[PDB]
Design a protein around this ligand. Structure first.
Ligand code: NAG
Ligand code: NAG
Lengths: 107, 116, 50, 46, 46
């Protein structure tokens, strides 16, 4: 299978700062099937980025991203307190799904 | 347009099965695919398996190969997942998610907590 | 196409039981601009109520 | 102006020059609809 | 005795139907969302 690994596993950042979260695939993947999600405890995962780009409807627009092959990144242009969250990348291979690593962001 | 509607929370005894119901609102039950994802407390998400209601095809995660049966009711636009031989290890929130062909978005239900 | 087309004929008879044999063509009576489906119908008859 | 409506849901296509001004709630699946706009129930007009 | 006809579908106020009746005074044609009796009739007193 194709395993996604994100980094850093945990991180402490201040509001007002730029932040990035990486997602590396063990095998190359189509950018068109990659997505990023945000999660708060007790909530269903929220989609932010799909197709390794393409900001999701209703998104804050502070989020953007890009990538290809085995290397993808989620960028937050400025962190707001509401952006401190668990974030993960997933691959929707449609016959295979890959999940794991929440790069947990705290103040 | 697309809305996923799930059944409520349940409490089980060891050895029993849980059948989670997911209704596809907005249409396109057919010509789309439905998957089930589990989240044990304190954990991230994991894939359990899924079905393509139109092609009558099921597919399972190796971790969940066996125990769980996934079906789909075309007439009521409803997908089901029944996980047998439950243990306290299976306490989790069970989520329904789907994608239409022609689209890129993955639509999600609410997640239902099942304890054992 | 939404029109209720009626053709008819009124002729004298002197009969009992079944329909008389013979030939007669009905003439257009009315062509009504109604716009409805009308799958079923019912015949309305009067009663000789005392 | 919200006083103008069109039919969004219908069971079968309309025949030429027929009108259908029924407002019965449309059932979009096998589950019987009781006039309540639930999962497969819609007001037919938009 | 035979006065007329009802042409319709449901015949219960939900859809329109065509009522054509020789009412022994006039001939009345109406198209309405009529609700019909389970035994429609007319009558005459002597
Ligand atoms: C007429 O009524 C029948 C039910 O007997 C229904 O199936 C059909 O679609 C209706 N047609 C129109 C134009 O309303
Ligand atoms: C029905 O008959 C009555 C007399 O019994 C008459 O006054 C009435 O006008 C008729 N109905 C219509 C619509 O003309």
């Amino acid at each position: 299978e194709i395993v996604l690994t994100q980094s850093p596993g945990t991180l402490s950042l201040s509001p007002g700062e730029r932040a990035t979260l990486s997602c590396r695939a063990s095998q190359s993947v189509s950018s068109s099937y990659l997505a990023w999600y945000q999660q708060k405890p007790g909530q269903a995962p929220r989609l932010l980025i799909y197709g390794a780009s393409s900001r999701a409807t209703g998104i804050p627009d502070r989020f953007s991203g890009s990538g290809s092959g085995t290397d993808f990144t989620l960028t937050i242009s400025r962190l707001e307190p509401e952006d401190f969250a668990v974030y993960y990348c997933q691959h929707y291979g449609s016959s295979l799904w890959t999940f794991g690593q929440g790069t947990k962001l705290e103040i | 347009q697309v809305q996923l509607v799930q059944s409520g929370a349940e409490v089980k005894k060891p050895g029993s099965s849980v059948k989670v119901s997911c209704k596809a609102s907005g249409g396109t039950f057919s010509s789309s695919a439905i998957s089930w994802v589990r989240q044990a407390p304190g954990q991230g998400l994991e894939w359990m398996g899924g079905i393509i209601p139109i092609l009558d095809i099921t597919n399972y995660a190796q971790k969940f190969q066996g125990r769980v049966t996934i079906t789909a009711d075309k007439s009521t636009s409803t997908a089901f997942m029944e996980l047998s031989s439950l243990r306290s290890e299976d306490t989790a929130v069970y989520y329904c998610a789907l994608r239409n062909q022609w689209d890129l978005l993955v639509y999600w239900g609410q997640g239902t907590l099942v304890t054992v | 196409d939404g029109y209720f087309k009626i053709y008819s004929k009124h002729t004298p008879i002197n009969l009992v039981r079944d329909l008389p044999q013979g030939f007669s063509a009905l003439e257009p009576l009315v062509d009504l601009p109604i716009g409805i489906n009308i799958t079923r119908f019912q015949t309305l008859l009067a009663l000789h109520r005392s | 102006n919200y006083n103008y409506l069109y039919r969004l849901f219908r069971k079968s296509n309309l025949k030429p020059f027929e009108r259908d001004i029924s407002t019965e709630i449309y059932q979009a699946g096998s589950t019987p609809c009781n006039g309540v706009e639930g999962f497969n129930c819609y007001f037919p007009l938009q | 005795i035979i006065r007329g006809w009802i042409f319709g579908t449901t015949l219960d106020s939900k859809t329109q139907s065509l009522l054509i009746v020789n009412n022994a005074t006039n001939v009345v044609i109406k198209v309405c969302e009529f609700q019909f009796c389970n035994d429609p009739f007319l009558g005459v007193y002597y």
